[PDB]
Amino acid sequence: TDSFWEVGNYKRTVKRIDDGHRLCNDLMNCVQERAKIEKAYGQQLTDWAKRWRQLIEKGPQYGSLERAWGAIMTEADKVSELHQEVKNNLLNEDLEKVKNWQKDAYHKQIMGGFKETKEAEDGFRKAQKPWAKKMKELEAAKKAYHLACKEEKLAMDKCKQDVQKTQEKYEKVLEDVGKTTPQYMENMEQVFEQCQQFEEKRLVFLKEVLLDIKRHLNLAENSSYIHVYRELEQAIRGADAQEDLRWFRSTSGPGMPMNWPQFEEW
């Protein structure tokens, strides 16, 4: 009695419809929440880069090694942009893709619920109408029989006659449900199949939107991520210790020009 074929259990296939709308909601939020995280990290990176671009500037570090060190806040900036770029590609391109599909696939009934849920609910019920009727007409003819049976095994004449009458009807109803049973299955099959087709439209779209997000989350397989570190490494391997020393000698040490003592008239 959890079988789709039992009266009323097509309802799970019906809830499934509603579910789809909710899951669209769910995906939208999921994506949204990931965006706010990618933003927080990019913001914190720029802040840090601001901090230190300034502290490295105002401090005693000089020459090329001051620049190499400063090339790090440059990656923090470039990397932050990339995350801030991921946040937009999630909100302008992915969350919107789902918003519009959701918008167009489900039409709320101005009065309530979805037009898509109603139609399936309505079609199952019509498909099941006769079967449900017979199925109650079989409830009685069994009760009235099981009652005349347990009553004829009590008076142990007219009781045995009433059991031949109830048994006869009962078996006739079995005959019907049998004859009606195939069209019922055809009918329900038909509505169910219309439900799959709609759910397939959704899953297929889901799979597509999922690949979209994987693409907007992947900083690798992007030349821009890998490039910032080729660049950083180049910037640092650039720095020359000697060169820095030579620059200090020349501007703060024995390299400085000097006006030595000379005769002064007057």
Identify the H or E element spanning 145.
Answer: helix 115-152
**Residue 15 touches Ca ion, criterion: CB under 5 A:** no
Alpha helices in 59-92 (DSSP H): 63-91
Tell me: does residue 178 bind a second copy (CB under 8 A).
Answer: yes
Q: Which is nearer to Ca ion, 40 or 210 (CB)?
A: 210
- Please give the structure tokens belonging to residue 26: 């769910």
From 4, 44, 59, 171, residue interacting with Ca ion (rule: CB under 5 A)? 59
> Whose Cβ is closer to Ca ion: residue 66's or residue 75's?
66
Number of Cβ atoms within 10 Å of the Cβ of 16: 16
* Contact call for residue 251 and Ca ion (CB under 5 A): no
- Check residue 109 and report its DSSP letter: -
Asked whether position 151 contacts a second copy by CB under 8 A, the answer is no
158 contacts which partner out of Ca ion, a second copy, none, CB within 5 to 8 A by kind?
Answer: none
Judged by phi (left if over 0) then psi (alpha if -120 to 50, else beta), residue 63 lies in: left
223-262 residues near a second copy, rule: CB under 8 A: 225-226, 229, 232-233, 236-237, 239, 241-242, 244-245, 248-249, 252-262
Token pair for 92 = 């302008």
Q: Compute how many other C-beta atoms are within 10 angstroms of the C-beta atom of residue 73.
A: 20
- Of 65, 105, 132, 159, the one binding a second copy by CB under 8 A: 65
Compute the distance between CA of residue 39 and CA of residue 33 in angstroms, rounded to an integer. Answer: 10
Q: Which does 112 bind (CB under 5 to 8 A by kind): a second copy, Ca ion, none?
A: none
Question: Which CB atom, from 88 or from 212, has the smaller least distance to a second copy?
Answer: 212
Stretch that binds a second copy, among 88-96, 110-118, 154-162, 184-192 (CB under 8 A): 184-192
CB 116 within 8 A of CB 74: no
